[PDB]
């Protein structure tokens, strides 16, 4: 329907759940520059229903922090126009949870490389 | 106080307003890789109180989309451990508001270079 198309949320405003997983919302994981690389099979199928999603989402920036911390640019290619962003979030290595944070994050970074 | 330090939000979870601007929350704008580069003096001063902030925040990714779309990495260095993120948000060049969106984003990208 036109109303569904006219009000359909863009990629950046979507939320992955069990009923609308990471692949459906954000595409399959891959090595290309416009492909996401984060998430094992569990997180991919479960999205924000993932058991440890709050511990992952603690590293996601607010809207203000996204535009406050990142290096923001705009690319124009034959495919269209893009708002590019790069940045880095420091982890507290003295936090008692630091060791668990690194293990959880490394479990999902490029997890698709080992997919059957 | 210890309670203020113990509950102090990390950089990525902060929100900039008139009472707590972009410089205080996310540091000065600059060209270094560690620095943010986005915002003219008005946005610096007003943060989410900026008049056109909803038009900018429409491009900020949700927590699920941040980890769904972005390329996530981990940098373990002697000076600390970082969560690195890069990505691109595609604009709709056929949207009637596209030309105004490009102007608004351009006005804030690297705007610190004009600052007298």
């Amino acid at each position, epitope marked *: 329907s036109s*109303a*569904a198309e006219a009000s*359909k949320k863009p990629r950046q*405003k979507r939320t992955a759940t069990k009923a609308y997983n990471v692949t459906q919302a954000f595409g399959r994981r891959g090595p290309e520059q416009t492909q996401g690389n984060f998430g094992d099979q569990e997180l991919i199928r479960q999205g924000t229903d993932y058991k440890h999603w709050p511990q992952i989402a603690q590293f996601a920036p607010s809207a203000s922090a996204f535009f406050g911390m990142s290096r923001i640019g705009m690319e124009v290619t034959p495919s269209g126009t893009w708002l590019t962003y790069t940045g880095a979030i420091k982890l507290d290595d003295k936090d008692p949870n630091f060791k668990d944070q690194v293990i959880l994050l490394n479990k999902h970074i490029d997890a698709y490389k080992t997919f059957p | 106080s210890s309670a203020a330090e113990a509950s102090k939000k990390p950089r990525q979870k902060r929100t900039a307003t008139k009472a707590y601007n972009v410089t205080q929350a996310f540091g000065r704008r600059g060209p270094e890789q560690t620095q943010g580069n986005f915002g003219d003096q008005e946005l610096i001063r007003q943060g989410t109180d900026y*008049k056109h902030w909803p038009q900018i925040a429409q491009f900020a990714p949700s927590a699920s989309a941040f980890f769904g779309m972005s390329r996530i990495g981990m940098e373990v260095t002697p000076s600390g451990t970082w969560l690195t993120y890069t990505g691109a948000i595609k604009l709709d060049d*056929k949207d*009637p508001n596209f030309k105004d969106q490009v102007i608004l984003l351009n006005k804030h990208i690297d705007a610190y270079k004009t600052f007298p």
Partner: antibody
Amino acid sequence: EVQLLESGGGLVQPGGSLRLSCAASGFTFSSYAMSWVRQAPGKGLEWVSVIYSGGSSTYYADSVKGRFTISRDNSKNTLYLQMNSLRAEDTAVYYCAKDHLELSAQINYYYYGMDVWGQGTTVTVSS
Amino acid sequence: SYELTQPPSVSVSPGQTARITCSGDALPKQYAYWYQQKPGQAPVLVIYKDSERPSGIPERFSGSSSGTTVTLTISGVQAEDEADYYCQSADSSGTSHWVFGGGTKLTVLG
């Protein structure tokens, strides 16, 4: 200024018929879908019908399907709602509203809310 | 039928923060739009695409999204903000058009 002006409301008996009209000005009426939205006394807003920019495609809420017919005359910048088989529950204020813009690339639909409303015309269906 | 769910009424005092919620299964995928209606007047669009203000709407109106719930927030609510508020969206199935929430009567106590 952009403006929608409804007319044709009145008092009718159940099973009767009535034709509403909405005159548009201030915007390119022919590029926009148009919708009728109604509000029974003391109740909420209820979308009832839409007609696309070319007047060829129409959709109806289940409550008025088969009884109401929406049409448009782009040569007059006018929207119409032909209401047949009227019931008591059709008693409402009927609003004309600008719907999504259609651009021909695949036709794309662009929507920033119903920012343009008519002041409404009152329809009373009572025996 | 696809339904949007709002509370029937919210009561606030001036200066407080008014919050009107709208719940719908398709809201994680579909934008919401908010309308303000005073008695005997046509509705007025106050928020579109979850969080954006049309020109002329005061800055104290804001909107946010959290999965199946969208929230219209009026900070420092004023007596003139007393009205009926309606959320509007569409099912993601693509077989229907716009649908309004049931509406929320906001009383301000001025």
